[PDB]
């Protein structure tokens, strides 16, 4: 009978969860070792442990069919069993799983091993993306130098892994279908537990898109004045290499040349950080201080003992794209970041420490619940703090921003600077997964794969390669997440919902009142707020124990993902910018790019 | 898997 079975099932889950945590710890350790120190030996070790865990998961998924779990009374037990049926890549036959893992490490290690030659010195060929190439892309205003580094990087990080990427798509699709999803797109989307999730995002993106187009138009206008019309056209897509970022995903590095009021203050605390002798250690300690100030959890000793917070100085290869790691025991959580002393990096630190906080908050949950309410929730946590960290209010408090007068013009500068990060990124984030979804779904013929990438980047972001590309090139894997098979929709979700969290935390902190000119949303600091911390504790402690609308409700009483809060934040910018574009007769929109030959 | 910046 079912009553006796459900009692037995509860006991089964309790034991299995603990076993899965312990086994995942072993896999995670091998993965950590590889990412910290890329060698053939560590690759082999990483992949063989995973093959072993995959085999164990196969038996787990099989064993779930012996339980009448869909018949149970307990929603909680049913939810746990459903999680256990989700094999993902582990559904693949033994040999196919091994080949997929070999394919994934080939791509990630290619990306991590990219070195290019100095633009001025063709014999100095040890320049890595992090930090050498990214430093040029962010600081250089020599358009030909920028174009050189763009071409060198994309050729090496993208084109070199076309064959591997093709095999990856094949095996991703096979895995998805073995789980009875149509493709890897539906597999990814399953994480959001909502059959209208794509439409919901389209609707929100459509509401914010006009604001993006104003920002795009104004930026293009200002770039024309800086570089001249031979480099930037009025009516064409923006050459992406001028936007201060290798993927043009965020444009804040060119704020000094595109800011609304060049004679009024523009926040850039990097120089002050260096002057005051800031170190990566100090930056992480400050992040820790922020969380504890909100009555949230202090970083445990294991974090300080085991983390890598600086790029190693030996000869070794490693992945420098920052990462936060949960080892599924108690208090064993780590970051690996190749930390630099900059304002932008200060944000990355808080962003990554948001993951660590999430790990600690839900570590008491059953193994299957020890993850985010949805992938977007995990990415949002640290960004809510970074929003506060970025305010003139907070930066003055900590002594990094000096002699700042917050008049109307400085406010517009700060709003525009934030938008160069937060609004600009939305079409970018959407295209990363629209591209991969279309490949997963079999909607693009292999002969059209590269220009299908650039077509999306054009349609949505209005940017283009600095040079003519073709199907001889393969540019998508030049983005880390694409080489490393990390879903990107999480970030689109995050950038929307982080404003819902931020607005609510700010209200709870007494830091925001729409009817009070002294408390604007764009100058809210939640540092020290126990009330904001209480909301985070309520939501984060839940892990994945309930569907994500329940986790949002626990934070602020709402159940719906909404673009209202992000629009509210930027409304004063929208009003000013619409008027400023009209004032300057700024052309809005772009013609179809000529930069990918079919 | 590890959680990473955009
Ligand atoms: C993705 O979708 C796939 C379908 O597209 C799906 O694959 C199906 O899974 C079924 C298992 O759930 C499986 O069904 C079994 O079929 C056996 C015979 O099938 C053979 O002949 C077919 C041709 O006619 C071939 O195509 C197959 O390849 C097979 O060779 C049956 O013998 C078997 O039965 C037994 O099991 C049921 C148990 O069912 C439940 O359990 C309790 C038991 O206490 C019942 O009380 C309860 O009511 C419930 O029915 C018993 O009822 C029965 O007595 C037998 O013991 C079973 O029906 C099917 O073959 C398989 N393929 C296809 C093509 O249908 C995948 O599972 C999906 N994958 C994922 C990850 O979800
Ligand atoms: C800094 C460091 O840990 N380097 C190690 C190296 O000494 C070792 O020989 C190799 C094994 O593949 O793994 C890596
Ligand atoms: C000032 C304040 O609110 N402090 C809270 C306390 O009330 C709560 O019991 C504790 C447990 O998480 O967290 C902290
Ligand atoms: Zn992240």
């Amino acid at each position: 009978a079912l009553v006796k079975e459900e009692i037995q099932a509860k006991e089964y889950l309790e034991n299995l969860n603990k076993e899965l945590a312990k086994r995942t710890n072993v896999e995670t350790e091998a993965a950590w070792a590889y990412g910290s120190n890329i060698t053939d030996e560590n690759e082999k070790k990483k992949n063989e442990i995973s093959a072993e865990l995959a085999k164990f998961m196969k038996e787990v998924a099989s064993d779930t069919t012996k339980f009448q779990w869909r018949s149970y009374q307990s929603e909680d037990l049913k939810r746990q069993f459903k999680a256990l049926t989700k094999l993902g890549y582990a559904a693949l036959p033994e040999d196919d799983y091994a080949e997929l893992l070999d394919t994934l490490s080939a791509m990630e290690s290619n990306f991590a091993k990219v070195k290019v030659c100095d633009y001025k010195d063709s014999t100095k060929c040890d320049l890595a993306l992090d930090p050498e190439i990214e430093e040029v892309i962010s600081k250089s205003r020599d358009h030909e130098e920028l174009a050189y580094y763009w071409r060198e990087f994309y050729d090496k990080a993208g084109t070199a892994v076309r064959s591997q990427f093709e095999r990856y798509v094949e095996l991703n699709t096979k895995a998805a279908k073995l789980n009875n999803f149509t493709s890897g797109a539906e597999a990814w989307l399953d994480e959001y537990e909502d059959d209208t999730f794509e439409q919901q995002l389209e609707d929100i993106f459509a509401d914010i898109r006009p604001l993006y187009q104003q920002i795009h138009g104004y930026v293009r206008f200002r770039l024309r004045k800086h570089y001249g019309d031979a480099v930037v056209s009025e009516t064409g897509p923006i050459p992406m290499h001028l936007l201060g970022n290798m993927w043009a995903q965020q444009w804040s590095e060119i704020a000094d040349i595109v800011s609304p009021f060049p004679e009024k203050p523009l926040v850039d605390v990097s120089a002050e950080m260096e002057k005051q002798g800031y170190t990566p250690l100090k930056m992480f300690q400050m992040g820790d201080d922020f969380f504890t100030s909100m009555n949230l959890t202090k970083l445990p000793q294991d974090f300080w003992d085991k983390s890598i917070i600086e790029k190693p100085t030996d000869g070794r290869d490693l992945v420098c794209h920052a990462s936060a790691w949960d080892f599924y025991l108690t208090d064993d959580v780590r970051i690996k970041q190749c930390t630099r002393v900059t304002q932008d990096q200060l944000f990355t630190v808080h962003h990554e420490l948001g993951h660590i906080q999430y790990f600690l908050q839900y570590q008491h949950q059953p193994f299957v619940y020890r993850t985010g309410a949805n992938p977007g929730f995990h990415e949002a946590v640290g960004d809510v703090l970074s929003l506060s960290v970025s305010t003139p209010k907070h930066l003055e408090k900590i002594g990094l921003l000096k002699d700042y007068v917050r008049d109307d013009e400085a406010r517009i500068n700060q709003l525009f600077l934030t938008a160069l990060d937060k609004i600009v990124f939305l079409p970018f984030a959407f295209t990363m997964d629209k591209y991969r979804w279309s490949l997963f779904r079999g909607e693009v013929d292999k002969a059209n794969w590269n220009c299908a990438f650039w077509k999306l980047r054009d349609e949505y972001s209005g940017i283009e390669p600095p040079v003519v590309r073709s199907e001889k090139d393969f540019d998508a894997p030049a983005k880390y997440h694409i080489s490393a098979d990390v879903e990107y929709l999480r970030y689109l979700v995050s950038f929307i919902i982080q404003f819902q969290f931020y607005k609510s935390a700010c209200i709870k902190a007494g830091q925001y009142d729409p009817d009070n000119v002294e408390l604007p949303l764009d100058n809210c600091d939640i540092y020290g707020s126990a009330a904001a911390g209480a909301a985070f504790h309520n939501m984060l402690s839940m892990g994945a124990s309930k569907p994500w609308p329940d986790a949002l409700e626990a934070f602020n009483g709402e159940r719906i993902m909404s673009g209202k809060a992000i629009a509210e934040y930027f409304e004063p910018l929208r009003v000013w910018l619409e008027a400023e574009n009209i004032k300057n007769n700024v052309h809005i929109g772009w013609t179809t790019s000529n930069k990918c030959v079919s | 898997r590890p959680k990473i910046p955009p």
Side-chain angles (χ1 to χ4, degrees), chain A residues 1-3 5-598, chain B:
Chain A
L2 289 163
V3 174
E5 197 190 278
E6 197 170 335
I7 297 170
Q8 194 177 321
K10 183 172 179 169
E11 210 170 293
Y12 171 83
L13 288 172
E14 223 278 330
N15 296 337
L16 185 61
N17 274 305
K18 292 189 289 199
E19 166 151 26
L20 287 170
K22 192 64 159 161
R23 289 176 182 266
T24 309
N25 172 266
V26 173
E27 185 198 34
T28 308
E29 280 290 356
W32 164 269
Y34 175 64
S36 301
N37 181 25
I38 295 169
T39 55
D40 286 358
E41 184 188 312
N42 281 342
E43 181 190 2
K44 203 167 173 286
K45 287 186 196 175
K46 179 197 172 171
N47 292 342
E48 283 176 8
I49 317 294
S50 286
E52 187 173 335
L53 181 61
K55 196 171 189 187
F56 181 80
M57 294 315 289
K58 261 198 196 66
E59 294 314 300
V60 169
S62 168
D63 280 351
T64 67
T65 71
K66 292 179 184 194
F67 291 94
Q68 300 301 317
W69 67 263
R70 293 176 183 88
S71 298
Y72 295 163
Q73 292 291 314
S74 173
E75 288 299 323
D76 185 62
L77 299 181
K78 292 191 284 173
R79 185 172 179 82
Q80 289 190 57
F81 268 103
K82 201 173 165 196
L84 293 174
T85 67
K86 284 162 195 190
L87 277 177
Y89 294 162
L92 287 166
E94 180 173 309
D95 286 358
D96 286 341
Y97 188 81
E99 189 182 356
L100 179 52
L101 290 189
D102 282 340
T103 306
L104 295 177
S105 41
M107 293 192 297
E108 184 163 30
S109 68
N110 180 88
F111 185 95
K113 283 172 175 168
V114 174
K115 298 288 206 294
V116 307
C117 300
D118 190 309
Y119 179 59
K120 297 170 173 79
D121 195 340
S122 57
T123 62
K124 190 163 189 291
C125 302
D126 61 343
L127 280 71
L129 177 71
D130 190 353
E132 289 86 23
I133 307 171
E134 279 195 320
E135 194 172 356
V136 173
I137 300 295
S138 52
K139 303 307 169 188
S140 172
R141 318 297 200 212
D142 179 321
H143 57 98
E144 297 209 333
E145 177 178 32
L146 293 161
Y148 166 84
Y149 284 110
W150 191 102
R151 195 208 284 280
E152 292 305 296
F153 184 75
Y154 276 75
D155 288 353
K156 292 173 198 292
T159 307
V161 295
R162 177 193 268 282
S163 63
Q164 290 94 342
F165 193 85
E166 288 186 13
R167 187 59 179 149
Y168 150 73
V169 169
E170 278 169 14
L171 292 170
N172 176 288
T173 307
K174 186 172 182 181
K177 291 183 178 302
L178 281 166
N179 290 289
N180 290 340
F181 292 109
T182 304
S183 75
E186 289 73 30
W188 279 353
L189 281 161
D190 187 60
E191 299 305 321
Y192 304 97
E193 289 183 75
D194 190 335
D195 64 358
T196 64
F197 203 71
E198 287 163 287
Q199 194 54 54
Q200 282 181 55
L201 289 169
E202 296 287 0
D203 293 352
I204 290 159
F205 181 71
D207 292 334
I208 318 300
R209 201 176 186 165
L211 180 57
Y212 174 70
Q213 292 219 110
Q214 297 291 312
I215 296 158
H216 174 285
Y218 186 82
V219 169
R220 177 172 56 188
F221 162 66
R222 293 290 299 273
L223 288 174
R224 284 177 66 210
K225 295 169 84 167
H226 188 90
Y227 286 103
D229 280 40
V231 182
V232 185
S233 76
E234 179 178 37
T235 58
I238 304 170
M240 73 188 296
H241 68 309
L242 313 171
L243 295 170
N245 182 278
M246 183 60 81
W247 314 272
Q249 64 188 65
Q250 286 163 79
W251 308 342
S252 41
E253 293 283 357
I254 62 157
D256 69 296
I257 56 174
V258 300
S259 84
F261 303 100
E263 298 198 340
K264 293 300 179 66
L266 178 66
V267 181
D268 186 342
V269 304
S270 298
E272 275 298 335
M273 290 170 70
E274 277 164 59
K275 188 189 168 171
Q276 292 175 40
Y278 271 54
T279 57
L281 185 60
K282 179 64 168 204
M283 293 162 76
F284 278 88
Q285 287 165 346
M286 286 175 79
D288 188 34
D289 174 33
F290 209 115
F291 282 98
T292 58
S293 84
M294 295 176 66
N295 197 27
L296 293 172
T297 308
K298 169 179 74 196
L299 299 173
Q301 197 55 50
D302 271 15
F303 180 90
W304 302 112
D305 294 353
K306 299 179 168 184
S307 290
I308 299 167
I309 62 174
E310 295 188 0
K311 188 174 182 180
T313 43
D314 49 27
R316 89 211 205 201
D317 290 300
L318 75 154
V319 178
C320 262
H321 190 98
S323 56
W325 295 72
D326 192 351
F327 289 82
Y328 301 102
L329 307 170
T330 309
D331 291 349
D332 190 345
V333 292
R334 295 173 218 177
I335 279 167
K336 177 165 54 74
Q337 181 168 339
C338 301
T339 318
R340 291 165 290 104
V341 189
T342 70
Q343 170 163 329
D344 169 61
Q345 279 282 281
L346 188 62
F347 302 154
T348 306
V349 165
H350 286 77
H351 172 88
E352 290 297 301
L353 286 172
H355 297 304
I356 302 298
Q357 187 64 213
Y358 215 158
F359 298 157
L360 297 169
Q361 288 282 328
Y362 63 46
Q363 73 180 348
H364 68 294
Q365 293 277 168
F367 172 77
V368 296
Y369 291 163
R370 294 175 72 177
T371 190
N374 75 45
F377 276 61
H378 234 294
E379 307 299 330
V381 182
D383 277 11
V384 181
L385 307 214
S386 288
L387 273 171
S388 273
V389 174
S390 77
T391 63
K393 179 177 283 157
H394 187 81
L395 292 169
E396 278 183 284
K397 278 188 203 165
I398 64 170
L400 287 181
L401 181 64
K402 303 182 190 304
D403 314 304
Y404 191 85
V405 180
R406 198 178 179 267
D407 55 29
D408 289 1
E409 296 185 348
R411 185 195 187 188
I412 294 303
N413 273 358
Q414 173 62 24
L415 276 168
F416 192 77
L417 176 59
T418 303
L420 294 177
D421 280 356
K422 302 298 181 178
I423 301 302
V424 163
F425 182 82
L426 307 178
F428 172 85
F430 216 171
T431 59
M432 294 299 101
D433 276 9
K434 282 173 168 286
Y435 179 65
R436 290 186 288 184
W437 291 344
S438 73
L439 303 189
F440 291 161
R441 285 161 168 165
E443 295 170 343
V444 184
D445 297 332
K446 274 190 281 176
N448 301 130
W449 273 22
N450 201 48
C451 291
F453 180 76
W454 294 118
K455 273 184 171 65
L456 282 170
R457 305 294 305 111
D458 172 354
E459 186 193 339
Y460 287 89
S461 288
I463 64 90
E464 65 181 26
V467 293
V468 176
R469 310 295 274 171
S470 68
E471 299 291 346
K472 293 176 179 185
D473 310 299
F474 191 64
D475 292 313
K479 175 66 191 157
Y480 173 75
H481 296 64
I482 297 182
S483 277
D485 179 40
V486 177
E487 187 258 28
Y488 217 83
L489 202 73
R490 60 186 65 180
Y491 304 109
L492 180 55
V493 179
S494 169
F495 275 50
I496 295 159
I497 68 173
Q498 75 184 234
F499 287 86
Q500 299 182 249
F501 298 147
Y502 183 70
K503 174 184 158 169
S504 292
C506 293
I507 290 165
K508 294 167 191 291
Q511 281 284 305
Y512 173 59
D513 187 352
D515 301 319
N516 186 349
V517 66
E518 301 303 330
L519 305 166
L521 190 47
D522 50 291
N523 207 31
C524 154
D525 189 8
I526 62 174
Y527 182 88
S529 175
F536 278 101
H537 172 67
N538 296 326
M539 177 176 77
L540 306 187
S541 61
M542 295 173 63
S545 63
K546 295 270 191 165
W548 68 263
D550 293 335
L552 175 55
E553 191 171 24
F555 189 96
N556 75 351
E558 302 190 335
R559 293 185 57 81
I560 300 159
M561 175 174 70
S562 178
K564 178 181 176 176
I566 190 168
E568 185 169 337
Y569 187 103
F570 288 104
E571 175 72 7
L573 177 65
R574 183 193 69 81
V575 175
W576 180 88
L577 186 60
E578 281 183 18
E580 189 73 5
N581 279 340
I582 289 166
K583 187 188 158 173
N584 284 272
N585 200 24
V586 174
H587 182 79
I588 305 298
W590 53 89
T591 53
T592 298
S593 175
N594 72 349
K595 291 296 190 303
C596 202
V597 165
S598 300
Chain B
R1 218 221 304 273
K3 311 262 100 83
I4 66 174

